Design a protein around this nucleic acid. Sequence first.
RNA 1: CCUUCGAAGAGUCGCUAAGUGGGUGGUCCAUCUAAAGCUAAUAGUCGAUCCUAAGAGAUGGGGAAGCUCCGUUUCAAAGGCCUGAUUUUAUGCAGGCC
Length: 43
Amino acid sequence: LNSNPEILLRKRRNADRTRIERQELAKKKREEQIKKKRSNKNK
RNA sequence: CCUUCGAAGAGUCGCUAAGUGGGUGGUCCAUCUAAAGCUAAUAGUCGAUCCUAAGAGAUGGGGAAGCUCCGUUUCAAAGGCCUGAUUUUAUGCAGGCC
């Protein structure tokens, strides 16, 4: 039926949720690093 | 040749030791240095093959001089599977289930 062969890449699964999770993880890591940095002045 | 030094085998000898100590002999003396070691002279289709039954019997462990025996899940690290942007001082696997 007059077709043309090609290669197709399927969409990655759960990319947006992974992106949001990574953004949240980065924010949490920054915040906890700040917490521990200013918590070490009372040693 | 001179001078300054100069260790010695323990559950062993005899319950369990000693360092001019100790072992063995002789009617005080004689002789050796244990408890370490080496050294020559006609079938895809019928059966088996598969499964478990009573039971037998490895592994783990224990006994016995040993040929071997007991014990069958027992104070055994007895193995499979899944998830993840690649795992935050920068690319040396983290978590979970039975």
